[PDB]
Amino acid sequence: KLVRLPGLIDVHVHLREPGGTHKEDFASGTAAALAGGITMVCAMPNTRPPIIDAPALALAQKLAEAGARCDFALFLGASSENAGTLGTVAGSAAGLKLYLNETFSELRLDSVVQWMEHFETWPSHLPIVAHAEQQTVAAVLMVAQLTQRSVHICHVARKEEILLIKAAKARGLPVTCEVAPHHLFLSHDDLERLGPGKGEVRPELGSRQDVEALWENMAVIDCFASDHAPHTLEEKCGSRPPPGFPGLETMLPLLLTAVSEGRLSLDDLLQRLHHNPRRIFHLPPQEDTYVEVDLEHEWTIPSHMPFSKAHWTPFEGQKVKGTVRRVVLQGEVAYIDGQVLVPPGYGQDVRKWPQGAVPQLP
Amino acid sequence: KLVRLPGLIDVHVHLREPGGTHKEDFASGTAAALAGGITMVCAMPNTRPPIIDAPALALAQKLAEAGARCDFALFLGASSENAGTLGTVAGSAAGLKLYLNETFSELRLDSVVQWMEHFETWPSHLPIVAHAEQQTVAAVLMVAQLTQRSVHICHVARKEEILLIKAAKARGLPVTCEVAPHHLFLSHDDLERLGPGKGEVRPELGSRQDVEALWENMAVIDCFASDHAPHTLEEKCGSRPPPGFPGLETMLPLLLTAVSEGRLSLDDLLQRLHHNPRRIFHLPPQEDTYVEVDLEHEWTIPSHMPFSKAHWTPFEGQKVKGTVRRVVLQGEVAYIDGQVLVPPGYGQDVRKWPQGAVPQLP
Ligand SMILES: O=C1C[C@@H](C(=O)O)NC(=O)N1
Ligand SMILES: O=C1C[C@@H](C(=O)O)NC(=O)N1
Ligand SMILES: [Zn+2]
Ligand SMILES: [Zn+2]
Ligand SMILES: [Zn+2]
Ligand SMILES: [Zn+2]
Ligand SMILES: [Zn+2]
Ligand SMILES: [Zn+2]
Ligand SMILES: [Zn+2]
Ligand SMILES: [Zn+2]
Closest CA to B99 of B86, B84, B110: B110
Ligand 4 centroid–CA A153 distance in Å is: 9
Closest CA to B221 of B159, B136, B158, B162: B162
Q: Which amino acid is at A296?
A: E
- Whole-angstrom distance, CA of residue B206 vs CA of residue B177: 17
**Closest Cα of chain B to A195: distance in Å?**
36
- List residues of B whose CB lies inside 8 A of any A CB: 1, 3-6, 125, 169-170, 172-174, 217-220, 259, 265-267, 270-271, 275-276, 278-279, 285, 287, 290, 295, 354-355, 357, 359-362
Residue B358 phi, psi (nearest 5): -80, 125
- Whole-angstrom distance, CA of residue A167 vs CA of residue A84: 32
What is the greatest pairwise CA distance in chain B?
Answer: 56
Which residues in chain A touch residue B220, judged by CB atoms under 8 angstroms apart? 172
Residue whose CA is at the smallest distance from ligand 2 atom 11: B202
Which residues in chain A touch residue B262, judged by CB atoms under 8 angstroms apart? none
Closest CA to A49 of A89, A79, A5, A94: A79
- Whole-angstrom distance, CA of residue B203 vs CA of residue A192: 60
Instruction: Look at the alpha carbons of B356, B357, B360, B362 in this order and tell me if their dihedral is positive or negative.
Output: negative
One-character DSSP codes across B140-183: HHHHHHHTT--EEE----SHHHHHHHHHHHHTT--EEEEE-THH
Say whether A3 and B361 touch across the interface (CB within 8 A): yes
Name A113's Cβ contacts closer than 8 Å, sequence gap at least 6: none
Which of A47, A227, A231, A240 is the best mutation target for the ligand 1 pocket, counting ligand atoms within 8 Å of the beta carbon and taking the most?
A227
Ligand-binding annotation for B131, yes or no, is yes
Going across the sheet that includes A71-74, the strands are A8-13, A38-43, A71-74
Helix (H, G, I), strand (E, B) or coil at A303: coil
- Distances A294 to A2, A256, A291, A299, A308 between C-alpha atoms, Å: 5, 9, 10, 12, 22
Burial profile A91-108: b = 16 or more Cβ within 10 angstroms, e = fewer: ebbbbbbbbbbebbbebe
CB A354 within 8 A of CB A282: no
Other beta carbons within 10 angstroms of residue B237's beta carbon come to: 14
Alpha helices in B241-333 (DSSP H): 248-260, 266-270, 276-281
Say whether B174 and A359 touch across the interface (CB within 8 A): no
Residue in chain B lying closest to A283 (CA): B275
Tell me the β-bridge partners of B293: B3, B324
CB B229 within 8 A of CB B183: no
Burial profile A265-299: b = 16 or more Cβ within 10 angstroms, e = fewer: bbbbbbbbbbbbbbbbbbbbbbeebbbbbbbeeee
Ligand 2 pocket, Cβ-based, cut-off 6 angstroms:
B 14, 46, 103-104, 131, 201-202, 229, 242-244
Give, in degrees to the nearest 5, the angle at Cα A126 between A86 and A70. Answer: 90
Name B148's Cβ contacts closer than 8 Å, sequence gap at least 6: none
Which of A227, A268, A288, A337 does the annotation list as catalytic? A227
CB B39 within 8 A of CB B71: yes
Give, in degrees to the nearest 5, the angle at Cα B93 between B146 and B359. Answer: 70
Helix (H, G, I), strand (E, B) or coil at A272: helix
Q: Reply yes or no: is the peptide bond before residue B203 cis, omega within 30 of 0.
A: yes
Name A300's Cβ contacts closer than 8 Å, sequence gap at least 6: A317, A318, A319, A320
Give me the architecture of the B3-351 domain, per CATH.
Alpha-Beta Barrel (3.20)
Give the one of A266, A361, A362 whose C-beta lies nearest to B361's C-beta: A266
Closest CA to B37 of B247, B193, B283, B318: B247
- Whole-angstrom distance, CA of residue A151 vs CA of residue A256: 28
Which of A22, A24, A97, A103 is the best mutation target for the ligand 1 pocket, counting ligand atoms within 8 Å of the beta carbon and taking the most?
A103
Other beta carbons within 10 angstroms of residue B148's beta carbon come to: 10
The CATH number given to A3-350 is: 3.20.20.140
The rounded radius of gyration (Å) of the Cα atoms in chain B is 19
- Whole-angstrom distance, CA of residue B117 vs CA of residue B79: 11
Closest CA to B107 of B62, B48, B150: B48
Which residues in chain A touch residue B259, judged by CB atoms under 8 angstroms apart? 361
Closest CA to B206 of B160, B242, B254: B160
Experimental determination technique: X-ray
- Whole-angstrom distance, CA of residue A326 vs CA of residue B157: 46
- Whole-angstrom distance, CA of residue A53 vs CA of residue A60: 11
Which residues in chain B touch residue A359, judged by CB atoms under 8 angstroms apart? 3-6, 266-267, 270
Ligand-binding annotation for B212, yes or no, is no
Q: Which amino acid is at A203?
A: P
One-character DSSP codes across B310-361: T---TTTT-EEEEEEEEEEETTEEEEETTEE-S-TT---BGGGSGGGSPP--
Closest CA to A301 of A251, A227, A348: A251
- Segments making up each domain of chain A, as ranges: 3-350
Give the one of B278, B287, B295 whose C-beta lies nearest to A287's C-beta: B287
Closest CA to B204 of B221, B187, B229: B187
- Whole-angstrom distance, CA of residue B359 vs CA of residue A7: 12
Alpha helices in A147-202 (DSSP H): 159-170, 182-185, 191-198
Residue in chain A lying closest to B289 (CA): A355
- Whole-angstrom distance, CA of residue B30 vs CA of residue B41: 8
CB A131 within 8 A of CB A100: yes
Resolution given for this structure, in angstroms: 1.3
Ligand-binding annotation for B155, yes or no, is yes
**Closest Cα of chain A to B180: distance in Å?**
20
